[PDB]
Short mmCIF file of C-alpha atoms (C1' of nucleotides) in Angstrom, two decimals:
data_model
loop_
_atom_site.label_atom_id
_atom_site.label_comp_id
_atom_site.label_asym_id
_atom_site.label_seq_id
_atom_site.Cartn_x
_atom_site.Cartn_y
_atom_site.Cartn_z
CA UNK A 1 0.00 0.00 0.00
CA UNK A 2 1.12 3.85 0.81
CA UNK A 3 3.29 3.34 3.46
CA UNK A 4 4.59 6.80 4.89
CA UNK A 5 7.63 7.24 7.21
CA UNK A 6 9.04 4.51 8.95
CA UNK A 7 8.63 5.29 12.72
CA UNK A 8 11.81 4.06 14.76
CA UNK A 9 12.37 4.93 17.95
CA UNK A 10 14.31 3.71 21.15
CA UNK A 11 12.04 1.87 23.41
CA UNK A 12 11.33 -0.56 25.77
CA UNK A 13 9.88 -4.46 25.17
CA UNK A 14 7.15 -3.50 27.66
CA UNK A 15 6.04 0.14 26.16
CA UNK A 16 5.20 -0.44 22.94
CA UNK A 17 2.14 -2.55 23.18
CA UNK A 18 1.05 -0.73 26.06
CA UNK A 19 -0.07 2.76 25.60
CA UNK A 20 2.63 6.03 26.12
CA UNK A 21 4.61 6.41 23.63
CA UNK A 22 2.26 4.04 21.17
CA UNK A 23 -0.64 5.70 20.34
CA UNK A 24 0.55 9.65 20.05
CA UNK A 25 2.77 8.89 17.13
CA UNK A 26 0.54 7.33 14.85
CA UNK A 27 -2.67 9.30 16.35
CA UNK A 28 -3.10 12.23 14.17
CA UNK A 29 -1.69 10.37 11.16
CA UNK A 30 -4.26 8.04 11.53
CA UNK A 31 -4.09 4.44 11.85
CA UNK A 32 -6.75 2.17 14.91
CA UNK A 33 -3.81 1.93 18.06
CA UNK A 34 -5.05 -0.51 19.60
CA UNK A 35 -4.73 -3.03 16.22
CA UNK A 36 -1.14 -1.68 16.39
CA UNK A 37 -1.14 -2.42 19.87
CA UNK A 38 -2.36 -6.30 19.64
CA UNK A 39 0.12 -6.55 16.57
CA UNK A 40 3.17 -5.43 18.95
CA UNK A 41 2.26 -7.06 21.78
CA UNK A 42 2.96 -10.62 20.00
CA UNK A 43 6.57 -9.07 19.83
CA UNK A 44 6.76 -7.27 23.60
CA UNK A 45 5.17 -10.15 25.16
CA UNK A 46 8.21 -12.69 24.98
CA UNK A 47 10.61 -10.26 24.13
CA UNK A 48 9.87 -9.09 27.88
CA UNK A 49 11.52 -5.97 29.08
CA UNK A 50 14.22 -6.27 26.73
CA UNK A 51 16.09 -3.31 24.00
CA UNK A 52 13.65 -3.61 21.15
CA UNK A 53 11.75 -1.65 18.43
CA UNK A 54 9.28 -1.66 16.42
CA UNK A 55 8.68 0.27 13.01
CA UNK A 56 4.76 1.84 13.43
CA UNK A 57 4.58 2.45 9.65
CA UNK A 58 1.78 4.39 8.16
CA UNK A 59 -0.41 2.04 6.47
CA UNK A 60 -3.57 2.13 5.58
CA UNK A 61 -5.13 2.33 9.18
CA UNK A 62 -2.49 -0.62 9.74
CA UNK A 63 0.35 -1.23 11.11
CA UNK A 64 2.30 -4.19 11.70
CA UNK A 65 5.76 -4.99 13.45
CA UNK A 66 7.87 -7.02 15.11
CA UNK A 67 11.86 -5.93 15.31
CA UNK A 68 14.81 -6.87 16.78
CA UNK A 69 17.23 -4.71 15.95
CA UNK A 70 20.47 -6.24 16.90
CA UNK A 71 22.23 -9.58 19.09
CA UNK A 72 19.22 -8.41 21.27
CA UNK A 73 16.22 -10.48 21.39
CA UNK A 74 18.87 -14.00 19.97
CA UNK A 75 21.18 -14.43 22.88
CA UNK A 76 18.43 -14.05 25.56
CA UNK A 77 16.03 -16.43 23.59
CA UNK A 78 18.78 -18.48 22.90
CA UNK A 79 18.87 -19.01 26.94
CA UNK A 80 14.75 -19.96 26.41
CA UNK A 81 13.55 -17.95 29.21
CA UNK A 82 13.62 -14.41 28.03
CA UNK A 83 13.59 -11.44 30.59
CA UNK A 84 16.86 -8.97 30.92
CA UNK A 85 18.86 -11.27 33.54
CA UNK A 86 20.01 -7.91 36.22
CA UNK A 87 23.65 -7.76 35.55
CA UNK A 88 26.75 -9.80 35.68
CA UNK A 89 27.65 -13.05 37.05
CA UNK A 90 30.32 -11.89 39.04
CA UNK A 91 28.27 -11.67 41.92
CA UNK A 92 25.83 -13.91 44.18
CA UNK A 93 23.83 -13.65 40.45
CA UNK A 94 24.12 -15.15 37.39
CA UNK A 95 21.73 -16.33 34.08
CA UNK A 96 22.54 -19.62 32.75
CA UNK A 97 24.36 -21.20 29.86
CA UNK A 98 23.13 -21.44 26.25
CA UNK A 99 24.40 -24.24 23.88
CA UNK A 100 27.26 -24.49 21.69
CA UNK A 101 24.21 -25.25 18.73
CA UNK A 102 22.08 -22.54 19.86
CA UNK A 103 24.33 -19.75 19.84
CA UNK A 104 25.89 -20.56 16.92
CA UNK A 105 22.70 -20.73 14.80
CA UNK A 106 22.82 -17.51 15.82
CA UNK A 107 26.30 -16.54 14.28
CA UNK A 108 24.58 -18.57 11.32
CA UNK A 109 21.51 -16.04 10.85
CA UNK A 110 24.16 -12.84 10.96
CA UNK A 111 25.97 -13.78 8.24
CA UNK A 112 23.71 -12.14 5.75
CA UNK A 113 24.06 -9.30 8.07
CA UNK A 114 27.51 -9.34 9.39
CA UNK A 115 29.89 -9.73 6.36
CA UNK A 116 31.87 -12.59 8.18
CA UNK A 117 34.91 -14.07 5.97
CA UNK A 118 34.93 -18.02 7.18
CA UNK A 119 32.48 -19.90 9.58
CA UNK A 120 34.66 -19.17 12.41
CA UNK A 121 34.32 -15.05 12.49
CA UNK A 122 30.92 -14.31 13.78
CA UNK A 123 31.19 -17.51 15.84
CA UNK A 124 33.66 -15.66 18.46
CA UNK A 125 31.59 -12.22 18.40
CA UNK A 126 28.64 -13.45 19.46
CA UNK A 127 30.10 -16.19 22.37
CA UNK A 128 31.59 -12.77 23.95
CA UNK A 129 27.79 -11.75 24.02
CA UNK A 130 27.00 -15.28 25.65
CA UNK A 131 29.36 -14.56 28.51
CA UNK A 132 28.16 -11.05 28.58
CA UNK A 133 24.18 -11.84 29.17
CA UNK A 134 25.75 -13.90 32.40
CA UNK A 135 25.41 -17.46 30.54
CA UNK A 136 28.54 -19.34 28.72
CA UNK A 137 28.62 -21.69 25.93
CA UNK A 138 27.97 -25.29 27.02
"C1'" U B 1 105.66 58.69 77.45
"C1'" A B 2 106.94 60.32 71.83
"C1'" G B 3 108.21 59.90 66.28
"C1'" A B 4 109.48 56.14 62.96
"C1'" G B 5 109.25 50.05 61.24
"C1'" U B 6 105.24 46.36 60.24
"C1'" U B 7 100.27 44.81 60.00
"C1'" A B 8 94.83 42.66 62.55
"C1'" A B 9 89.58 43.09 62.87
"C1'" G B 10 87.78 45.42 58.55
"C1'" G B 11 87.27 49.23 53.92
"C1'" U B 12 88.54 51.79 48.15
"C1'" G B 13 81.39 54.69 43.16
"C1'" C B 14 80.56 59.18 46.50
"C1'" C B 15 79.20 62.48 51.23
"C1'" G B 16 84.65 61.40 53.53
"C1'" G B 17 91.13 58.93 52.28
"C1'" A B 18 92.02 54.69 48.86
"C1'" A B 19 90.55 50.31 42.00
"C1'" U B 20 84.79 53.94 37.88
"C1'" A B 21 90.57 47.80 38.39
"C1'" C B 22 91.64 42.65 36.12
"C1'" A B 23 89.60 37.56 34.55
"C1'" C B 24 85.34 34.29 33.94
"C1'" G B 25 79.87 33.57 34.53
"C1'" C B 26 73.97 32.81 35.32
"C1'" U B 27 70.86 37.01 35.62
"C1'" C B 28 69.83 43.63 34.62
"C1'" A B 29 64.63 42.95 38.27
"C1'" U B 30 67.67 48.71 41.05
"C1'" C B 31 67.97 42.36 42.23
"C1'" A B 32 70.61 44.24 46.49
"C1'" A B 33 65.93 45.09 51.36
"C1'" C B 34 61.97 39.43 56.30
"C1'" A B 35 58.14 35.78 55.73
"C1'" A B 36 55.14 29.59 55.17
"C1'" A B 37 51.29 26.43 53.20
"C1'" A B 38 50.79 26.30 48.11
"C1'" G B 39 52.03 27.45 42.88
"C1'" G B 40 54.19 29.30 37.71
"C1'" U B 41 55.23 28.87 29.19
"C1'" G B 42 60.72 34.35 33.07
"C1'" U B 43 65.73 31.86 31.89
"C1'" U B 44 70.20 28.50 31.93
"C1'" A B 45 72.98 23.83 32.82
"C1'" G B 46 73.85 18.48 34.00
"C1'" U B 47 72.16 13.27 34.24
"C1'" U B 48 68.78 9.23 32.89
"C1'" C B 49 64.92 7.56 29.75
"C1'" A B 50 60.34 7.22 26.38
"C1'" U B 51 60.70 8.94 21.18
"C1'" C B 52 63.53 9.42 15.83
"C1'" U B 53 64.77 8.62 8.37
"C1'" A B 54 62.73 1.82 10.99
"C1'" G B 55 59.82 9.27 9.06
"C1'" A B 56 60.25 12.32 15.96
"C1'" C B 57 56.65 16.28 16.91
"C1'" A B 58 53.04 20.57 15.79
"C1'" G B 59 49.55 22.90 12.53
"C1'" C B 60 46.36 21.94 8.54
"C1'" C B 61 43.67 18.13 6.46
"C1'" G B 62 40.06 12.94 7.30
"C1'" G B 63 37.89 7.64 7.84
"C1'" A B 64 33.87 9.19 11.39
"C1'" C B 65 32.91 2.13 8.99
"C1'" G B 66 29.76 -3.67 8.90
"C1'" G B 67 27.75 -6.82 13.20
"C1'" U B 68 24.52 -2.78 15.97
"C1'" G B 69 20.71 0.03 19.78
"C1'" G B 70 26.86 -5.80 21.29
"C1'" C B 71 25.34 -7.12 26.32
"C1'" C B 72 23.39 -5.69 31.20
"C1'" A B 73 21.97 -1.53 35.91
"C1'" U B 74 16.59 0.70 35.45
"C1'" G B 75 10.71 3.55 35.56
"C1'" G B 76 13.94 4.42 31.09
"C1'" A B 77 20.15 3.53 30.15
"C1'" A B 78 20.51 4.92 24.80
"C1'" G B 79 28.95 3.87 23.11
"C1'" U B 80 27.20 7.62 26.35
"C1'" C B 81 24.15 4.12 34.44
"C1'" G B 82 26.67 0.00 36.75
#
RNA sequence: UAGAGUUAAGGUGCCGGAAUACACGCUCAUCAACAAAAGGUGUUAGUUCAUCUAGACAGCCGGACGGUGGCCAUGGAAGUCG
């Protein structure tokens, strides 16, 4: 259809869905918000208070989305349960571990995004990630 | 108790007798003429070391990249909170 500008914006996996920042910016313009709404929170819903956005594109009284714009919404639903774990595992605290299969299939999807050279390169990137989100590679 | 012979403590630009001398040197502020914590592109030298044609350093001039909003504090955290 006529689709008009693309609307990104840094948010929350809890906000959009909800009602703040969801309905102003396509209010006016004119699309139903609480269809947009039901359409992000499939998206917010598992991907639970984590860094996500979603495009609320100017359809025709539509919108759809679902985005994860980065290592995001992988590595945490790599580890199956899905919340932001509350810092390192340093402490008294700690996530998990996700397997050596599961977080390399995700070193397999970014390789149409990240322009890796052999089947070793986005392997290593991403397992500093898995230590980072307080899990390991098992 | 007195005139000579020789010199200490210390002086010679001038009031007021005696170098406006000699050699080398930082510095010329009239320094010379009190004062700490605490501090400085005045200005000079020695020693040790990073650094150097294996292109030191400054100014002027650029590439500001793909993964990507990497991850996680948190109401939110965004390279840019921990």
């Amino acid at each position: 259809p006529n689709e008009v500008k693309y609307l990104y914006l840094r948010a929350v996996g809890g906000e959009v869905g909800a009602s703040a920042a969801l309905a102003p910016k396509i209010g006016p313009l004119g699309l139903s918000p609480k269809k947009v709404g039901e359409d992000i929170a499939k998206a917010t819903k598992e991907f639970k208070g984590i860094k996500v956005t979603v495009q609320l594109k100017i359809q025709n009284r539509q919108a759809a989305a679902s985005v994860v714009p980065s290592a995001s919404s992988l590595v945490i639903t790599a580890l199956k349960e899905p919340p932001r774990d509350r810092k390192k595992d340093k402490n008294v605290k700690h996530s998990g571990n996700i397997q050596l299969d599961e977080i390399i299939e995700i070193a397999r999807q970014m390789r149409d995004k990240s322009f890796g050279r052999t089947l070793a390169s986005v392997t290593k990137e991403i397992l500093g990630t898995a230590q980072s989100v307080g899990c390991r590679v098992d």
